[model samples]
Target: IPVIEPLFTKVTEDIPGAEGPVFDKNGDFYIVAPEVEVNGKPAGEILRIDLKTGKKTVICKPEVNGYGGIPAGCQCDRDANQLFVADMRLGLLVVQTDGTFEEIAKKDSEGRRMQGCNDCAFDYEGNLWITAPAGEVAPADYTRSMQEKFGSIYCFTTDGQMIQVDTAFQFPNGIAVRHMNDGRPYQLIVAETPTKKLWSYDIKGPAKIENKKVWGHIPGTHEGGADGMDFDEDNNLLVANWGSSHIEVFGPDGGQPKMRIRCPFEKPSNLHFKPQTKTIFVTEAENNAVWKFEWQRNGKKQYCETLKFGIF
Candidate 1:
């Protein structure tokens, strides 16, 4: 077993519940812990915790099933004041840091509400690429509608433009960007939750990218599943193993993981690392803990030193 040193700071005793973990430029990590059940059936809350003090504040508490469906994927801008959230009921919602929220997008290409969203990621151009469970169940029910597929990746442009980038996917879940230290072409990586495969694409740059190919494949630990991911500053990829009950850290090569550390929880969905501090924040939907790991980077290449307290 790879023993990693991580700073285990039990920040909150047991706040509502957490899902997504993203850090701002200032090293402040905001976790989407829906204080309620999925779809806002009873509504949930967004908890903001200060790393320095372990102090928590309820930034916003959305009414369960507030608008259309439930909330799924979420991300924030550089300003850290606004959060872009994916609502399975609605399309997408913009929640301000002050707790104010707005339904930015709620329907798909055919004007039908997105059923449920799984994961999301922000491209270089500031567009949000999301894995939404849209379209009609085809083949079995194709007689009624042309839309037949389990899911697709929808793009939410910076200018508020919405479109489905790709429609052929088996429950597309986690989304990430492939970065190279040599400054080669950037690519997009998606974890096909149901297919148990790692999908990759040749991105032109941070500005534009094209769907290229399936980069890697993962043996679904038990039942086929995969989810949220983020590329570390070193270009190393960190992924949330939805069905594996852990995370898989793959190097530039893909299939082979340099670090395969098991998490303390079961459901590892989406995760992120603050480039400024090299601190890792992971979201575990089925657990009670979100972790913060500090990897010591020397210049550009550094080792993920797990400290005495398991602080990676």
Candidate 2:
């Protein structure tokens, strides 16, 4: 295993639960801290953690159906201008660069609203993909004892066309698009929380995924399972094992584990990588703190350094 060298101790922004770290081109990142009460009223807002001054700014506060909306998994569009936020209460939403929050989708093809939308991603085709665990409002409270296969994955285009990829995943949580180091598109990776597994699919052809199979599995019980994941510049998977004191990294070409870095904080929620600075930002939901780390394996140009910082 590779020990993650500590860069900053911990940065607290006064939020109770901090999750979803998605970075923009400018280095500023967005995070989810739901139900922020303002004057004794719940205010649904997504915060922008400033990179330069370390200021926590309220970028977009949405008023969803008279109730405060809770933001979860988030991803930027191809241009990194607009942000797509998955809400456990409001379903899928898009936060514009101009600071407008719009509820895009909530109901399924059968016209039934989901239990709750957990995480989201964007395919190469410009469609937005999302995950919804069954019988729950979000993956934060998910557990293995729940009825299996009630979770599902769905994708929709901006033109209103929608397709349900799989309808039986066990608590689909983190979602991300995978690619080759050469920048060629590849697959869609989703974390199955309760099962402690990562699922992959060939999403290159239209909206249909070909080989729906297990991509990786994390051994041991950590919280419910995996929370969120992101691909490095080299396309390696960096994932947060919820409730565990560590983040695991896997190789780009294979599902084999490359390294595991024990985290300083508990209940790691989500993480994002910065290729330019060789840094990674993470959200510790329970501790209400966000952290940063300097990667020893920064940007691997060759496959030989895939396990560079490993202790094995």
Candidate 3:
């Protein structure tokens, strides 16, 4: 076990859900901070944190995006100028770098409301990948399995179309896209909290996603099995083990736990790596704070690595 110390825990929560920690090109990170009430009304807001200075700034509130619910997962476009958000009540939302916003997708093509927009990621094809709990569950409890085939993943395109790519997930939560050896993005990996497993899927040819494979599994997790996760620069998976109250690092081959960072927070919801500094910024929702951390590998690589790489 490696030391998982907190760099800062200064994040504020108008509400309990403090999700999404994506780093922009400018070295600043953004997270969704929902408030319990707003001058007698329910509301949420997006916050920006300066990693170096440890300063916090409010980016936008619920009124700007016309959202009637709390915001969850978040990801930025290539330029980091356009920020996309997944709302627990509403479906999807897009907030401009300047703070203006619009609805990306609120309902499916068949005019059915999305169960719950949990998290999102972007592929090399410029398509948006989203995850939602199969059906009725508390937002915090949505990551664990419901025993039914309700969890799903969807693809959103530039033409304003939403397509269901994969289903039968047990509370699919955090998501990250992986780039091929040639540096072309092709696949996505997700955290299924209830089953205490990591899932992988292929994103190829005209938004056709298939092959639901178990990338990795951490046995003995609680209802809050896994929450939010991301990949490091070297493609190592950093997962938020909510029930375990720690962060786990799965080797590149997507097998076996290589490293574990014992967290000091009450509940770890999500984390993201800062490529520039080679560190991770994590959010602790239950504790109403965020943490910054770094780690050093103790031994050699867990598995054999290869140069000739196809779909992993």
Candidate 4:
């Protein structure tokens, strides 16, 4: 029953589609505006935002073939000083600090081209997890894409292995890995948008997982369901309810939301905690802007936050 207000609303407004808010080890803030234009063409641009001066800089515009790629979600790997991007058109990509990028995975281990990439997260073992909700359909055809059940999840290992862990979802949008304090992964959670169901998987090791089950559910009748999510130091899952105009906090057991933090906009796509702080940043699609609010608990440390060098 707790309501919160945005510390800074409309931090960057009028973005074509504002989603994916993350911070690098150097505390540089970045977000993906997936519908941006370059040379009069649709090129999704990764932007760096200066929180102090409210200035925005284009860091990268990933492309595939002759068309600009749509970059949806991103995560910073402090270990390698790299930024990972999930692009619907281009598949998985890695961007260096200087804005140079390379396409890491265009297909899974089976060699099947990725249907569509939506979001990504890095586990404690430095493995990258991705969600693909579009299912071989372009973003312009989102309505038709949602009707089919070809959504999937992929895992990219530290040693360069693309494993398709699961498939056949309505729209698996957001993903996160719950880890122990010592950096051991415990659970893999994914949000199926249209169904409002948060699915969970038991992480046995690096890229090995088993026991897929329903972890929790988001309470709402709105069509938009759950979008992005993350965990706090105490293991509470904070989920952005896309059409519900709020973030729902689920406890460790994951039954119902323990608390609801309200947002000024309707479609909050994703959220991430500023490293070592309780300040949470959110991206909302309704106004294509980013907002921030103070949280009750500090975020659980991510793999990128702990390892300074390569994983040992």
Comparing candidate 1 with candidate 3, which one achieves the higher TM-score?
3
Worst 10 residues of 2 by lDDT: 299-308
* Candidate 3 structure quality by residue, lDDT tens digits, 150-230: 787777875668777777787788887787755576678888877788888776754576787888886454667777877
Q: Candidate 3, which ten residues in sequence have the lowest lDDT sum?
A: 298-307
Best by lDDT: 4
Greater lDDT among 1 and 4 belongs to: 4
The Cα error of candidate 3 at residue 113, in Å, is 2.9
lDDT of 4 by residue, 35-136 (tens): 887786768988899998768888888775666778899988856778898887777888887888988765678887666688998997788889988655
TM-score of each: 0.77, 0.83, 0.81, 0.93
- Runs in model 2 deviating more than 4 A are 35-43, 134-148, 181-184, 253-256, 297-312
lDDT of 2 by residue, 131-235 (tens): 876444332242322457787787876567556677777788888777554433478888988788998888765467778888898656755668888776677
Best by TM-score: 4
- Name the better of 2 and 4 by lDDT: 4
Candidate 1, which segments miss by more than 4 Å at Cα? 1-8, 13-17, 25-27, 38-42, 53-55, 63-69, 109-115, 134-149, 179-185, 204-212, 243-245, 296-312
lDDT values, one for every candidate: 0.60, 0.69, 0.67, 0.83
Task: List candidate 4 stretches off by more than 4 Å.
Answer: 1-10, 37-41, 137-144, 308-312
